[PDB]
Amino acid sequence: LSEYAVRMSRLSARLFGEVARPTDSKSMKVVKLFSEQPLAKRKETYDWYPNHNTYFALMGTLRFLGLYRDEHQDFRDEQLRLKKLRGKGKPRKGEGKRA
Amino acid sequence: SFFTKLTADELWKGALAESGAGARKGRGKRTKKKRRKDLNRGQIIGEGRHGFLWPGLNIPLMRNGAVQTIAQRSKEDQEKVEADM
Amino acid sequence: KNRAARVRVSKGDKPVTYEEAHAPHYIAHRKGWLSLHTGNLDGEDHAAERTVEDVFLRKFMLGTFPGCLADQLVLKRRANQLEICALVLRQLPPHKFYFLVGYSETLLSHFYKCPVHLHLQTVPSKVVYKYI
Amino acid sequence: VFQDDPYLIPTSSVESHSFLLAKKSGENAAKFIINSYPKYFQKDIAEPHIPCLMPEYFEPQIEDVSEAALQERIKLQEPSANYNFQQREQSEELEEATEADNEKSKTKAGTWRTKNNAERIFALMPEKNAH
Amino acid sequence: VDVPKDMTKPEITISDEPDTLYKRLSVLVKGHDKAVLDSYEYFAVLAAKELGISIKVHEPPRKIERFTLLKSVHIFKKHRVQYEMRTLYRCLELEHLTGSTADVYLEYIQRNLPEGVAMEVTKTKLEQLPEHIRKPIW
Amino acid sequence: YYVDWKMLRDVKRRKMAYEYADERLRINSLRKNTILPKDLQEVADEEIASLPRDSCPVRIRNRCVMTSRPRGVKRRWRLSRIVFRHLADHGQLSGVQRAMW
Amino acid sequence: AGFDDDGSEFHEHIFLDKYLQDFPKQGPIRHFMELVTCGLSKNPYLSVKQKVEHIEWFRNYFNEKRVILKESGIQLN
Amino acid sequence: RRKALPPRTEKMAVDQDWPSVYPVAAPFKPSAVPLPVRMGYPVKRGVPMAKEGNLELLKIPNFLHLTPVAIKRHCEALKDFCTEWPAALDSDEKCEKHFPIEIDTADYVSAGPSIRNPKARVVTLRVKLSSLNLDDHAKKKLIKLVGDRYCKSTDVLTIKTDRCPLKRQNYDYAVYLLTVLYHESWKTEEWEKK
RNA sequence: AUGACCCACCAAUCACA
RNA sequence: GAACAAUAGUAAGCACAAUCAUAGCACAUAAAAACGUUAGGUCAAGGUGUAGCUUAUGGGUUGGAAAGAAAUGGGCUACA
């Protein structure tokens, strides 16, 4: 190691746009922090889920508009219909416990 | 919750429980009976309870030699339709 | 026993498509893929998105064409455009068929923000590979 | 334009007409759904961002302000006249450009209402002839 | 019998600018199944021999990614299912090309890319020297 | 509807953590540095701990996209192994196949 | 295709010295902010605008607390 | 009312040009294709399934638009857009003697809604040091300044540029880095005597 | 060497006017 | 419900077999393995029948979930 080598390195670092003045291994973490995309900002993170409300609501509307046909919801429907016919329904809110 | 749904065949196969182990050894009684009903039986393409009329599906494409516009039935008309179904 | 994606042997009367007649160990050997896209290749991205798209497409197409859908969908993705190829029973008058062709193509083009092509191949009844 | 299979292929001229007309009526249905409920189609994916696949807004962007709602509802015919009537009730002056656009809308959309709209065009504003 | 008359109207302009030179152009097609990459290599080589682009083709070693999942919904850990993804490669190496020929060939080729394959283009382009470096010294 | 309430809570977490990402990054720049004085980093510590609890990235869970399953997920498809296998075994995942060697 | 990044050129990305103009020149804040600046220098995912808004947040936060800086044992501007 | 029309294969002339039928990339409708083709696994007595209703032929990418006749025609229509390659450059020696600098740039195509590939930024700069005007001192000072980016056996210097959003910004920054390396290799300073 | 008791086959469809 | 110097058995189908994979054969390995058996395992992957809750068996926030008397399984490191 020489002073010539240290000057050469300070020059290469100042030139290529890397960190100029000597730093701790611990402080370089801030360089790393702003050199990257923070985790919570990545499309693999905030965009992870598809929007389930858009799909559900849209296909629900399209079903009511008679375009899309949902057999699963049809099943649920007829089952519930027969269930309220049988005499066991869903209690109107507030009625069930005390009565 | 849309992706959480299934085919009608799968749902009936599930609810009927014909393929179970109770059916084979006669581990359950014959007086207990439940059946499968088609839920697509009385439905027509384009029909919904919102009441829309689509040129290619619900209603004929051309009325009086012209092209029918997308339209919606009256409230009471839909009441009578649902009564019929 | 392996139950995965299997059509169990019936009394011998059961009509079966070429598709359903082959278990998971026969993919890439006898039967091919029902979807084609780049995202599952070695160096490539957004497999997840293409998958969710795929699922919604199957569900949607099944609900939009009730009862006339013959075989499982074929989804080809080429340079931002998706061609949906479908085998369809002859049920509806061609009026309804075209109505839904246009309606679907438009709707999914506007939903997924890319050009959507829809190719219908009509068949008299379910093509039978086995039993029956 | 038509589907390639032997079942959906048009046999006669009337069939060609009914088929294509049906396809268009379907596209119309789809677009109707898009514009009735835009928020469902809002989320964007495509990188080049095609502006053509976005839902359309046929509502006025401002309500009580005259100088916006006039032109806004004119671009959209009767809502334009309700707008011009809401601007004329507030004693807001309609310039040479305003009812030249409302005029171009009286010619593009629309015999008594023509005479009345013409009277409002000439009497209120001294419109330059060229419009 | 029925021939449309005067069917051709191409539009090409020549700018005075010195069109970019490409020393070498590598086109790497990744695929799943081999046969598609074979017919695509045939198609690409033919399309290059028709434009006189003088290309070589070789096959980069295939990559198979394997991974393991549980076979059972709930609990048997002794039992697994193993899945593969096979990526196969074709490398079309074209030499001594110009910018226009490069954009035409790459357009034609990229339009006809099959749905299940992907493509990576490495262009090494020729530039003489930058201005401030030519023979000044500071 | 997101398939579960859990899935809902995680969607909210990803929205909040996306919103405060800048604040957290900027403050933890001060906090992760030796060069600055300790008197600054103590106040910066109280600043980043002041931030809403649900905005920090370590509270986010990768869940199955369709089925909401909290683990046994293949990150590349964002899918539970079960759902994944279901899709793959029907030939619906391009390039995926059973492994024989 | 479709994205030019505001017609910006690399010097508006690489060299941020221009926004370090108002800051104490010989202090530890120069160490800190030269590290911050180098990090933003290496950053592909941000525009010029956003990097500038980072620098300015730090300007405003450091200029927010003069008290703790003076008391710290180093007089800072 | 049920309508069944005989396939296109009936009206198809024997010598009819094929690229007319399949101009673009197509799904393979079996009605529009004249050739009997049996694909699918056979059954013990039976044969492979016919082309009608066959889903497996639908799954296959078909090169039917690319039939060699169509490639001849297409490429003969593309002969107009292509510009010639300079004669004297035929050998790599003259390529190096004339153009010293190679700029490597990567372009990626993948199917889907978005075009954006993060790998497309990177621009590589390979420059031979024998094609540069450098002094002995300037060359040794350059070698020591760049370090790892220089190959001592092949004398090829490499500048890999990443840090900026666009490949043009990275191209400019690579060229600029080269320029400043050359300008700052010729400068002798105080500590160089140390 | 020992190992409560109890376990099993006695009902018929779909589709159309 | 078989006797091959043959005495009542023909049988499509599914398994086994064969092919396919592990980049040439071969071997090996992988994969495959019907119908059924153990009311085997899983309503907490998800979906569901039946029966239950609905100002609560539902939805949030904050903080807590300790521990080793003992017994034992599978491992890691050893006793050189």
Ligand SMILES: [Mg+2]
């Ligand atoms: Mg649940």
Ligand SMILES: [Mg+2]
């Ligand atoms: Mg975690």
Ligand SMILES: [Mg+2]
């Ligand atoms: Mg005893």
Ligand SMILES: [Mg+2]
């Ligand atoms: Mg006993």
Ligand SMILES: [Mg+2]
């Ligand atoms: Mg017998």
Ligand SMILES: [Mg+2]
């Ligand atoms: Mg037999």
Ligand SMILES: [Mg+2]
């Ligand atoms: Mg073999």
Ligand SMILES: [Mg+2]
């Ligand atoms: Mg063997």
Ligand SMILES: [Mg+2]
């Ligand atoms: Mg095995």
Ligand SMILES: [Mg+2]
């Ligand atoms: Mg076997």
Ligand SMILES: [Mg+2]
């Ligand atoms: Mg049990």
Ligand SMILES: [Mg+2]
């Ligand atoms: Mg249990």
Ligand SMILES: [Mg+2]
């Ligand atoms: Mg449950």
Ligand SMILES: [Mg+2]
């Ligand atoms: Mg808690």
Ligand SMILES: [Mg+2]
């Ligand atoms: Mg122990």
Ligand SMILES: [Mg+2]
């Ligand atoms: Mg163990």
